[PDB]
C-alpha cells in the first residue's frame, strides 16, 4: 500500500465523481493536511491555470505526471476536442493516474504515455502529432535542457509553443534557464511562487581510492 495509493483512495471517497475541480481540491486537501507529496499544489496550479487560459493550446504535452494533479488541473482547462499527452516513466504511477483521470472523467481528454521521455519524444511525430501547443516540464530536472533540445531536433516546436518549467529554482534548473533565456529562440518570462514544503531523494557516494591505473 503506497501513498500514491492512499491519496487515489482519498479522491474516491471525498471528491464528487466525474468533477475535477472537486478531485484537486481532494488531493490539496489530503497532502496539506495527511501526507505531502510532490503535486504542483494550489498556488502553483494557479499560475497554470493563467498560463493555460492565455495561451489557449489545442495540444499539451507533459512531462511527469505522478498521480496526475498537474495533468487534471491542465485538461479541465481544454475546449472540446484538444488534448493533453503525459508522459510518466513509472508504470504504477501511469496507473495511479488513470485511475485519477477517469474517476475526475477527463479520460477522454488525457492520454498516457508510460516511457521516459528522451525516448518518448522522437516518437510522438508517429500519434497524429505535427507541432505542440505548449509543454510543461515537470519530470527530472537534469532531463529538462536535453529533452527541450530533443524537441527542437524532432521538429515538435512551432513559433509561439509555450514551455512552462517547474522548479526551475528549487531544486533549480540553472543549465536550462540560461539556455532559454540566452538564446534568441525562446522569450522567458519568471513567476515566483511561495514553496511551504519539498522533500527530494537524494544520496551520498562513498568512492574508495585503490591505487591508480
Ligand atoms: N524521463 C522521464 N520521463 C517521464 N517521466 C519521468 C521522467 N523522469 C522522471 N519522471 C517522472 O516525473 C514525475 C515527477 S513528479 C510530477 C508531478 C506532476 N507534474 C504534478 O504536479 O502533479 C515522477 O512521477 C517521475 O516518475
Ligand atoms: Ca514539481
Same mark, same amino acid.
Given at each position: 500500500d503506497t501513498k500514491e495509493q492512499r491519496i487515489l483512495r482519498y479522491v474516491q471517497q471525498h471528491a464528487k465523481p466525474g468533477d475535477p475541480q472537486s478531485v484537486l481540491e481532494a488531493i490539496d486537501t489530503y497532502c496539506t493536511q495527511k501526507e505531502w507529496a510532490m503535486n504542483v499544489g494550489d498556488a502553483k496550479g494557479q499560475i497554470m491555470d493563467e498560463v493555460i487560459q492565455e495561451h489557449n493550446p489545442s495540444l499539451v504535452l507533459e512531462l #511527469?505526471? =505522478?498521480? #496526475?494533479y498537474s495533468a487534471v488541473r491542465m485538461a479541465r482547462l481544454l475546449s472540446p476536442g484538444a488534448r493533453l499527452l503525459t508522459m510518466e516513466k513509472n508504470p504504477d504511477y501511469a496507473a495511479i493516474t488513470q485511475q485519477m483521470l477517469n474517476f475526475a472523467g477527463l479520460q477522454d481528454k488525457v492520454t498516457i504515455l508510460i516511457g521516459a521521455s528522451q525516448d518518448l519524444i522522437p516518437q510522438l *511525430? *508517429? =500519434? @497524429?502529432? @505535427?507541432?505542440? @501547443?505548449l509543454v510543461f516540464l515537470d519530470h527530472w530536472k537534469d532531463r529538462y535542457l536535453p529533452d527541450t533540445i530533443l524537441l527542437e531536433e524532432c521538429g515538435?516546436?512551432? *513559433? #509561439?509553443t509555450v514551455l512552462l518549467a517547474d522548479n526551475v529554482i528549487v531544486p533549480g534548473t540553472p543549465d536550462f534557464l540560461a539556455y532559454v533565456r540566452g538564446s534568441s529562440s525562446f522569450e522567458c518570462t519568471h513567476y515566483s511562487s511561495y514553496l511551504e514544503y519539498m522533500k527530494v531523494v537524494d544520496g551520498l557516494e562513498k568512492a574508495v581510492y585503490k591505487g591508480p591505473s
Open positions: #511527469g505526471a =505522478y498521480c #496526475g *511525430k *508517429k =500519434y @497524429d502529432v @505535427d507541432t505542440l @501547443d515538435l516546436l512551432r *513559433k #509561439g
